[PDB]
Paper text:
We first rigidly fuse DHRs to HBs to generate a large library of oligomeric building blocks. We then generate assemblies with cyclic, dihedral, and point group symmetries from these building blocks using architecture guided rigid helical fusion with new software named WORMS.
The second protocol simplifies the process by overlapping the helical termini of the DHRs and HBs and designing only the immediate residues around the junction (HelixFuse, HF). For the second approach, HelixFuse (HF), the same set of DHRs and HBs were combinatorially fused together by overlapping the terminal helix residues in both directions (“AB”: c-terminus of HB to n-terminus of DHR, “BA”: n-terminus of HB to c-terminus of DHR). We were able to solve the X-ray crystal structure of C3_nat_HF-0005 to 3.32 Å resolution. We show that it is possible to genetically fuse DHR “adapters” to natural proteins; these proteins can then be used in larger assemblies through WORMS with less likelihood of disrupting the original protein fold.
Residue numbers in the entry:
A (entry chain B), C (entry chain C): 1 to 348
B (entry chain A): 1 to 347
Write the structure that this text describes.
Amino acid sequence: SEEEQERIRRILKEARKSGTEESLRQAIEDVAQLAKKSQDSEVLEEAIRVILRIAKESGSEEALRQAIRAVAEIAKEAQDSEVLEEAIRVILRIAKESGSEEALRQALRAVAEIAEEAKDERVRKEAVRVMLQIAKESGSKEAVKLAFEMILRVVRIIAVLRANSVEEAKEKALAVFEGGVLAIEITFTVPDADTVIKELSFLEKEGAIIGAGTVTSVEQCRKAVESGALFIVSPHLDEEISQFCDEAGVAYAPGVMTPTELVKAMKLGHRILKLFPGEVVGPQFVKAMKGPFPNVRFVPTGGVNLDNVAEWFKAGVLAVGVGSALVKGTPDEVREKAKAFVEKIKAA
Amino acid sequence: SEEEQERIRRILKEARKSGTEESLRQAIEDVAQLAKKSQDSEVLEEAIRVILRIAKESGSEEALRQAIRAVAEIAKEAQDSEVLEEAIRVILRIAKESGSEEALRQALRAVAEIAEEAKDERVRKEAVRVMLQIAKESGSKEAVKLAFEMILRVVRIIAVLRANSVEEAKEKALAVFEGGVLAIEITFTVPDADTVIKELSFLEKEGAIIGAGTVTSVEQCRKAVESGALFIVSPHLDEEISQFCDEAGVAYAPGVMTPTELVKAMKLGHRILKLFPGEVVGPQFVKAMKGPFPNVRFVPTGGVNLDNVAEWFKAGVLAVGVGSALVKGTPDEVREKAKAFVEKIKA
Amino acid sequence: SEEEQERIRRILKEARKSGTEESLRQAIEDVAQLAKKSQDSEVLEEAIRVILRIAKESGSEEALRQAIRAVAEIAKEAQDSEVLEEAIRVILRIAKESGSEEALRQALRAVAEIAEEAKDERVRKEAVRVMLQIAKESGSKEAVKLAFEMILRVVRIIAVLRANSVEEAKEKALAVFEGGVLAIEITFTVPDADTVIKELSFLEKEGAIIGAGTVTSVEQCRKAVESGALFIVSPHLDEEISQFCDEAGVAYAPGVMTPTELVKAMKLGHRILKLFPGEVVGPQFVKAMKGPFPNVRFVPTGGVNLDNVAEWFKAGVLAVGVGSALVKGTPDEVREKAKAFVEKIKAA
């Protein structure tokens, strides 16, 4: 393997000596070509970190975007999760260098695709934290919705927590974390809900996402975004709120229940919707919405349980919002329920 | 105990000779104190008469509204229903002399709370009759809404009546009233429904409340009122009907089906909503709305049947609207199904 | 027999010698009297030629409309389909001679009623073909709505086509037409639905009716009606589409799901509504709507299948919109399942 290792170095030294820009992007495809013929974990990591310096020296977005597709292909060919974690951190470095958001959208879809074919949770925890930073590093009008859509596509399950004692609530939030589902949503009905989402903001740095729900007024939503909420679930579409999330750069997934309410939600720029109550319309609703409204996905949060969640995802839902069937009870028991829901989603 | 009648008459005569309003408000507290130590039905009902005698002599709003709480507390401590019937009639007379919306609102919640703990059909009939008269006074928007809300809490079940003639509707409404159903909704599918609600006005004197359902227009609602209806029930949310019902002083329960329609109904000022069709959304909808909308209560009028009616009230529902499953058949059949629904609602 | 045929010749010759319109009006009821007493496919279909033949006194919406009820009565008592076909064509010529709005609307209900006694389907295809020409003679807003209601009253089932090419959409449309489904809705998920509607416009002269579905904008709706669409279908209620469909003389069935959406559609002048998704609310919804809204008809286009369509019509639905369960598969499969849907509706 030391022979091809030197070969990757020889391509580098000769590509730098070649002042032509075509040989620079050609060196990207040359390194990717030999990485496709390899089967070792360490070889793919050296190849990926090599493509970084080539495109950054080119200074053109055509080489940066071509590098994102190369590292994403090497990560799909690999088998060690160590290379996948470095691939995600590398894609962040490429997209951050361009910063033109044409690559940021492509980087998010690549990061979420790498986390999709992941055997352990460490890769998915790396992804969610990076996609948050990618949307944060972007800091613009879009990307937050694409991050929200992709992160939900990775975490698959979002919990609905409610407890009067913040001591008991955080005992459940960490507990549902321990199951590995991540992406916990806390209800705003809880009296000291501002504090629970601020003290649980340390989960954001470990691969989780915290948000507020049942938000009905702009004043209540302002309190959530100041406390650390990254998404506002809501019970029904609100015109005043939806304009505040777009100005504040926070994702907003309003609640709909009929196709007519769906169209009014799309008229305000919301293709990520909340199906509420989900148990009322059932999975037949999301199946019937695919035809007339493609590329539009929902997150049903109603009477979803272990018997329901199996047939919600076969209908093509983005994520599912479970509440009493997951969080209610002692913390150690909802850790086993959080593991049970993840196991049920991965199968059907 | 005859000694308590003396002591009660001593507290009145002593505080009457004083005349100071400080001692008069203390006389209500002294009479209410001895009433809590006694278990005689005649000692308690005499204390209620004296509490009224003291308050109406004081004349102040503070003393009159304190007398309402005292009479209401004596009712909660009593077992004889004749004490509760007397308390309701006294609560009416105290708020009637006082006036203002605060006393009349406090009286509406008091006589309705007494009706729940009464566990007797006679007291619930009197509560409806008094609450209608309390709402007839003042006549404010908040009075007719609160009175309609408390009345639905007491009767628990409203009958959606449909027939093929005025006489068949009159006999069905009387039959369902004998079963224990005190609230009757007359749809406009019955021919001459305005004549049916007009000739059924004698039931409102025996503890009933007749209204009009299936109201689609304002011309339809204008004929429902003036003909004697006390509440208007529509399958959807109408902006003009809610306007006409507000300025006419009549309760209005519109129909909703989705949380988006719920919020729009609250924006108009209605927190007592008709869930229609209730059989489509099911009790899962009512439990789901309790979270973000706690101060909103529903009345499902869909496929409410003896099987699911138990599950509806287990979901925190104000009242249920039944039809066909209740009002279909002979008057004898309606009377027995009326007794069956009231029995299963008691749970 | 022909002893009655000679009598009909005498009724016409003698009443024509009189010339008084009261005797020509009596000649119609005399012919319809002896036609009621006879059972002969040749005596009946000749009696209605004479009733049409007695147009010497122009009804001007008096004698002509008396002729329509007489020929519609002869067709009701008949059994031979050749008499029913001749009755429909004669009613068209009588209403075309009058030109009044009452005669044209009375002819629509007469022709549609003749097709309800079905058996041979060429009558139903001729009825739809004739009812379209009647609506184009009137051209009023009431005529387009009534003709659309009557055609759906006859065809009972609408095919909701979704394809991935113009050629597969054309082939499936021909396949569902040969199966017995005379109503075809071309969704805009098809790449070039306008050309599909345009190339399928020849079926409208054979007894079919081509329309567009899943329309969201007025630009979409204008291209559909300019391509040959005779009815516009949307998943929700669009105020601007209803405005354009009115001034363009094209039927429009909006989508409703709650009773409040029902009322908002009626106040715009729509009593033929699309219940969507029908599988979510179920036939319990349409049964409960007939109480407050007896004039509304509904066409459920949800999860309609062979097990569903039986209990949809028992609840009194006008027509049903079937897709996937009818359109998906090879063109050879969708022919035989179209025959099964038509056969299942005929029974229950």
